């Protein structure tokens, strides 16, 4: 089963006790070593990880557990393709050498860049495939609201997607999803992912 970079992990501790929670019993139900959140270039279980997202959330009634641990996340959970995307021209560049080197963070993440005369802006379209696994719900979210964090980091602090899309129907509060991610946020649709103008791909980091 594929592997996934631990720092996605990254809160995880933090996030449970804001919860009132306990989070050793989950690590050791989804066969997380504990202690691997703050060991760099340790890899953990995408399925387990992405299992735990969805216990955590279903049994401490926190429909917005992925939103909320990106908090303590951002670009760098990404490590060495962080720096590669930090090195490029254009906010366009950082985010397509994330997709091309997403295989790095974990083999089980696809991101295609599109472009097409026929509709607007750049889409980013995210894929979560792994054998096996429910639909990675919390996880999807817990991406998102990772790359509006990106977009920031690389596109400047009032840097924002135009849209964001998710394939499942809304879980979380209106505010909860404004919160993280800003604009535009479509759900129950057939692509996950989201967009930027032009304007802003085409912005020096
Ligand atoms: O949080 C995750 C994965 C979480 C999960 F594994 F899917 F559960 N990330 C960070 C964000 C992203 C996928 C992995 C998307 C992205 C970008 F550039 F599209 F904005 N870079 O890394």
């Given at each position: 089963g594929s592997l996934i970079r631990a720092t996605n992990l990254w809160g995880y501790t933090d996030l449970m006790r804001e919860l009132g929670a306990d989070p050793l019993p989950f690590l050791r139900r989804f066969d997380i070593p504990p202690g691997i959140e703050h060991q760099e270039d340790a890899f953990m279980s995408l399925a387990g990880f992405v299992r735990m997202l969805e216990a955590s959330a279903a049994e401490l009634d926190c429909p917005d557990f992925g939103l909320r641990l990106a908090r303590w996340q951002?670009?760098?959970?990404?490590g060495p393709v962080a720096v590669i995307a930090r090195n490029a021209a254009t906010l366009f560049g950082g985010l397509e050498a994330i997709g091309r080197y997403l295989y790095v963070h974990s083999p089980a993440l696809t991101l295609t860049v599109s472009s097409t005369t026929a509709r607007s802006n750049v889409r980013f379209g995210y894929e979560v495939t792994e054998p096996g696994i429910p639909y990675p719900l919390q996880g999807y979210e817990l991406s998102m609201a990772n790359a509006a964090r990106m977009i920031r980091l690389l596109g400047g602090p009032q840097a924002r997607a135009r849209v964001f899309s998710f394939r499942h129907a809304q879980l979380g509060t209106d505010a909860a999803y404004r919160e993280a991610l800003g604009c535009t946020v479509r759900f129950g649709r057939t692509w996950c992912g989201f967009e930027v103008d032009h304007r802003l791909a085409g912005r020096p980091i």
């Open positions: 951002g670009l760098g959970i990404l």
